[PDB]
């Protein structure tokens, strides 16, 4: 009833209305292992939970006891599960619950169970009207929160909410173009809307990507996107690009462009392109510039790449 941090907070044993129920101690065995020295405020609430649960007292009061148990350890799925058992059985205001979880997810955004709970609620109500707005608020405090982005992808796909996600992405890339979670959301939207088969779309994307690379050449996320949207369909399938990059070599040649280059040749030595040997040398030469001067951390990778480019080509 009274919040765990309130000055006038009283343990559960010292509470009247909780007298008829005996506290159930935790059974850790004769000589425990990894036995946590729980604080008194902690051990109290759970000793009482182990009770209403051990009885399955699907009572309204045990429903209130769940909030406190969840507060002390939001990661307790046993408690959360029993909270949904009571949620149903006592027919509580699912609209009041959304209000709860919103505050919990706000105070403990990086927790698994808080988010899963919110889903179950949206499902039950079959109502996502507050979703986007809420996830954007959490994301506003942490643009990369995984649990957030995952819940966001669910909403959209479940309730056909693609309409504004792209614009959302664009806004967030503005704020931080290095946000790899938003470049992922970008691929997500498109893939389930226009797809990248449409030349006008694919077209727009490459320019935008390129413009971002130009704007911030060392932001790996953009390179990755460019690669992801072209790679499987065939880099060798788009000749201009190969050149439009080896024309920025002087003013831009970070290890990211050199690396992309090697990516392109490898696809040529695949679909078979003229001067199959001139390429090989253009690739090996590059693997060593990487494995020796510009990407020494990846030397064992590039050494293998080169070795494979021969091995299997020749």
């Amino acid at each position: 009833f009274v919040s765990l941090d309130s000055p006038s907070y009283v343990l559960y044993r010292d509470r009247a209305e909780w007298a008829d129920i005996d506290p159930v101690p935790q059974n850790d065995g004769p000589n425990p292992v990894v036995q946590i020295i729980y604080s008194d405020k902690f051990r109290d609430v759970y000793d009482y939970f182990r009770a209403v649960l051990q009885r399955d007292e699907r009572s309204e009061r045990a429903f209130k006891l769940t909030r406190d148990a969840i507060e002390l350890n939001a990661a307790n799925y046993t408690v959360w599960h029993f909270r949904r058992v009571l949620l149903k059985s006592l027919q509580k205001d699912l609209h009041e619950e959304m209000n709860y979880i919103t505050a919990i997810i706000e105070e403990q955004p990086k927790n698994y169970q808080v988010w899963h709970h919110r889903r179950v609620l949206v499902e039950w109500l079959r109502d996502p009207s507050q979703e986007l707005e809420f996830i954007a608020d959490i994301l506003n405090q942490d643009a990369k929160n995984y649990h957030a982005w995952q819940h966001r992808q669910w909403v959209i796909q479940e309730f056909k909410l693609w309409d504004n996600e792209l614009q959302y992405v664009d806004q967030l890339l503005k704020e931080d173009v290095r946000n790899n979670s938003v470049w992922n959301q970008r691929y997500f939207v498109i893939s389930n809307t226009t797809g990248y088969n449409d030349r006008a779309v694919l077209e727009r994307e490459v320019q935008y990507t390129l413009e971002m690379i130009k704007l911030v050449p060392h932001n790996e996320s953009a390179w990755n996107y460019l690669k992801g949207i072209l790679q499987d369909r065939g880099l060798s399938k788009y000749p201009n690009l190969l050149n439009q990059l080896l024309d920025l070599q002087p003013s831009h040649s970070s290890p990211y462009l050199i690396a992309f280059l090697v990516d392109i040749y490898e696809d040529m030595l695949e679909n078979q392109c003229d001067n199959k040997e001139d390429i090989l040398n253009k690739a090996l030469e590059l693997c060593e510039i990487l494995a020796k001067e510009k990407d020494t951390i990846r030397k064992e990778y590039w050494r293998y790449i080169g070795r494979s480019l021969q091995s299997k080509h020749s």
């Binding site: 059974n27 946590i36 604080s39 992808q153 064992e300």
Partner: protein
């Protein structure tokens, strides 16, 4: 300077924000700065075993109220600690061991699987921890605790129509579960013909444009989930179901050029625990690519800078009081201890049939005990465990 992290040329790996600022570059630059000083300071590396031993030893028995947040993950607490005692090659007393078996038995549900602690509902994550902690112990007493029937019956209650599993009853879905189910189904010899039906194919939908694997289809490629899926595939022998080349280009990209360590996802921060979750992926690929006949595989090294990781763990991840951590400025904890040490072990030992070549920076005492890249428990703990259960029925 024989250290890759401490030479003058290495000081060129600092972030190039191209004069543009975002909350990402700023943070990347803040870790690099703190990593600079740590590097600086030093100009041989030692693994504070004793100091770590006490930390581990104490923990195993008692924890401060600081661990109230991991109350529903106690079997994890066992595994993380026992495994760090394993790596550091420290024998486990028969009373310690038994008490562990006794504890994990009160966590085991009457329906199969295990719970976070005594009386808790069964969950795949803690179940994995126990079956893993039980095998590290290695005795018959250990093994015999697993209600091999109940387990399989429990995995079956979580399996979904799409090949994916639930974490626990009424819980969410993500590649972590398939790994938990796969790891326990394999060690205990309980895989029935249709158990992982369409699983390999689900784990596969989790790989994305990045080359790595997300929690669920569509999500960003993360290093913890990627290990979860590739390793699960290694168990089910479906490694081939993934574009391994893109997976390899990706995982290898995850190692930081400056820090030396790995990040969990592109454009984020370096963490000591990723020394396993990410670097552990290499031994796995190396295996699959070998099973394909790849002739270009190195014969003495892992496809990642083994010296740099070690240098990151040895210079930046140890706590004076003992234990290893995320990054400098973070408080020690048993999970980062387990995976920092697990990482190191992988950074030191190379396998591939007869080909065994070990790298061991710092002193010789720093050398650790090997760990099986698929279960993260002693290579021998695995052979020993599967053997025992193979000499058992299945149904």
């Amino acid at each position: 300077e024989p250290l890759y992290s401490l030479r003058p040329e290495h000081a060129r790996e600092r972030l190039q924000d191209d004069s543009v600022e975002t909350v990402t570059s700023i943070e990347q630059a803040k870790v690099e700065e703190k990593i600079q000083e740590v590097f600086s300071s030093y100009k041989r590396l030692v693994l504070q075993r004793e100091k770590h031993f006490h930390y581990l030893k104490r923990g195993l028995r008692q924890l401060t109220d600081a661990y109230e947040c991991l109350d529903a993950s106690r079997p994890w607490l066992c595994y993380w600690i026992l495994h760090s005692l394993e790596l550091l090659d420290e024998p486990i007393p028969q009373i310690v061991a038994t008490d562990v078996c006794q504890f994990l038995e009160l966590c085991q549900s009457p329906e199969g699987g295990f719970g976070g602690g005594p009386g808790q509902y069964p969950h795949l994550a803690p179940t994995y921890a126990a079956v893993n902690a039980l095998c590290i112990i290695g005795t018959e007493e250990a093994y015999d605790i697993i209600n091999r029937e109940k387990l399989l019956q429990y995995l079956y209650s979580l399996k979904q129509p799409d090949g994916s599993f639930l974490m626990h009853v009424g819980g969410e879905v993500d590649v972590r579960s398939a790994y938990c189910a796969a790891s326990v189904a394999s060690l205990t010899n309980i895989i029935t013909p249709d158990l992982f039906e369409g699983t390999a194919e689900w784990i596969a939908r989790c790989q994305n444009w990045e080359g790595g694997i997300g929690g669920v289809p569509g999500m960003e490629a993360h290093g913890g989930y990627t290990f979860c899926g590739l390793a699960a595939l290694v168990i089910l022998k479906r490694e081939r179901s993934l574009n391994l080349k893109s997976l390899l280009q990706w995982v290898t990209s995850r190692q930081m050029r400056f820090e030396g360590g790995f990040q969990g996802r592109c454009n984020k921060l370096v963490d000591g625990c990723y020394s396993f979750w990410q670097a552990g992926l290499l031994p796995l690929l190396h295996r699959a690519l070998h099973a394909q006949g790849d002739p270009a595989l190195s014969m003495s090294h892992w496809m990642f800078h083994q010296q740099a990781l070690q240098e990151y763990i040895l210079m930046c991840c140890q706590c004076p009081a003992g234990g290893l951590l995320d990054k400098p400025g973070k408080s020690r904890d048993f999970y980062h201890t387990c995976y920092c040490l697990s990482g190191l072990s992988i950074a030191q030992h190379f396998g591939s049939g007869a080909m065994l070549h070990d790298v061991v920076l710092g002193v010789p005492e720093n050398a650790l005990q090997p760990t099986h890249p698929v279960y993260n428990i002693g290579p021998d703990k695995v052979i020993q465990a599967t053997t025992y259960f193979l000499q058992k029925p299945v149904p």
